Amino acid sequence: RDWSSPQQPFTIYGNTHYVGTGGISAVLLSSPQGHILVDGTTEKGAQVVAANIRAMGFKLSDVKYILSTHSHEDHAGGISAMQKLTGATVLAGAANVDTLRTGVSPKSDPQFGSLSNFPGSAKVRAVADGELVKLGPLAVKAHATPGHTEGGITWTWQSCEQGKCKDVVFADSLTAVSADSYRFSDHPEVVASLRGSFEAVEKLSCDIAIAAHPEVNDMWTRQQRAAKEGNSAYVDNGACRAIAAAGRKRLETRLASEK
Numbered sequence: 001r002d003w004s005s006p007q008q009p010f011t012i013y014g015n016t017h018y019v020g021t022g023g024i025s026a027v028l029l030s031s032p033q034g035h036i037l038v039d040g041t042t043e044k045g046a047q048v049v050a051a052n053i054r055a056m057g058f059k060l061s062d063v064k065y066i067l068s069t070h071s072h073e074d075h076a077g078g079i080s081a082m083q084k085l086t087g088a089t090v091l092a093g094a095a096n097v098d099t100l101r102t103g104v105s106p107k108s109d110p111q112f113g114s115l116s117n118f119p120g121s122a123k124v125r126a127v128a129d130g131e132l133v134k135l136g137p138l139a140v141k142a143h144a145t146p147g148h149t150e151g152g153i154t155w156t157w158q159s160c161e162q163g164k165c166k167d168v169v170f171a172d173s174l175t176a177v178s179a180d181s182y183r184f185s186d187h188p189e190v191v192a193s194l195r196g197s198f199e200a201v202e203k204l205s206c207d208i209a210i211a212a213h214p215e216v217n218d219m220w221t222r223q224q225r226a227a228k229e230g231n232s233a234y235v236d237n238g239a240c241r242a243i244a245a246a247g248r249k250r251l252e253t254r255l256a257s258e259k
């Protein structure tokens with residue numbers, strides 16, 4: 001379950017399909033009028049993602065949007081390649097747009113000094129908090145969830161099976177991690193951002209959460225359960241509350257260690 005590892009794709013619920021690697025989530029939200037891809041994994045992982053979308057029966061050329069959670073190599077490293085293979089437009093939080101274009105995270109990132117650059121993407125555009133991304137019958141809402149990066153977005157939609165619908169959340173990372181030289185206690189905008197994001201995420205309507213690092217919401221344990229119990233295994237309307245609580249815990253542990 002390395003970041004670039006192959007992973008057989010699978011449907012989580014309705015038109016929501018996992019197409020990521022063994023280590024990094026990516027989701028295809030499908031329709032007859034074309035598809036939305038959330039995240040690209042790594043540069044090497046783009047070849048996995050692309051094969052996975054085809055394995056689920058879909059054409060790359062029908063992927064119209066690529067939505068970015070945030071602009072680090074593990075989630076975004078494959079976006080450029082995917083953008084070239086699909087022709088899609090890439091959508092991201094305002095403050096991450098320049099990072100996706102260049103593949104270089106800025107000094108405001110707590111991990112600056114320890115991040116690896118990744119390929120820059122074409123066709124990157126900003127979305128605002130609350131904004132809807134529409135494609136045919138698809139409707140995906142952007143929620144600003146800054147802190148791990150300034151432009152982090154958590155994306156939400158509804159998927160249905162014969163009219164039984166669930167609220168699905170692709171949860172951006174909420175983790176306070178840094179370079180050795182970085183003190184969170186000196187950076188109030190990042191701390192405030194993280195706290196506001198924990199609050200936003202724990203309030204989301206959230207039947208199925210797919211975390212950017214899938215194991216954050218126990219994806220693989222859930223998939224193993226689904227073999228027997230079906231896709232109810234992915235459903236847990238407390239999962240966004242749990243991702244938020246873990247984020248909060250990680251930040252409070254860190255602030256205490258900095259005293």
Ligand SMILES: C[C@@H]1[C@H]([C@H](C(=O)O)[C@@H](C)O)N=C(C(=O)O)[C@H]1S[C@@H]1CN[C@H](C(=O)N(C)C)C1
Nearest residue numbers: 072073074111115148173174175177212213216
């Ligand atoms: C530092 C991490 C990782 C990246 C990394 O491993 O370098 C970094 C670029 O940000 N990505 C991260 C993120 O939260 O998006 C964070 S924490 C994440 C949650 N549990 C994962 C883990 O512990 N693994 C060994 C896979 C990593």
Ligand code: NA
Nearest residue numbers: 006007008048
């Ligand atoms: Na694969």
Ligand code: NA
Nearest residue numbers: 014015016030
């Ligand atoms: Na489908």
Ligand code: NA
Nearest residue numbers: 001022023215
């Ligand atoms: Na994993």
Ligand code: NA
Nearest residue numbers: 080083121122
């Ligand atoms: Na590109």
Ligand code: NA
Nearest residue numbers: 068069092093
């Ligand atoms: Na974003």
Ligand code: NA
Nearest residue numbers: 095096099149
């Ligand atoms: Na950024």
Ligand code: NA
Nearest residue numbers: 101122123124
């Ligand atoms: Na661009």
Ligand code: NA
Nearest residue numbers: 110148176177
């Ligand atoms: Na961080």
Ligand code: NA
Nearest residue numbers: 232233235236
């Ligand atoms: Na259930």
Ligand code: NA
Nearest residue numbers: 174243246247
């Ligand atoms: Na978390």
Ligand SMILES: [Zn+2]
Nearest residue numbers: 070072148173
């Ligand atoms: Zn990251």
Ligand SMILES: [Zn+2]
Nearest residue numbers: 072074075173
């Ligand atoms: Zn990550």
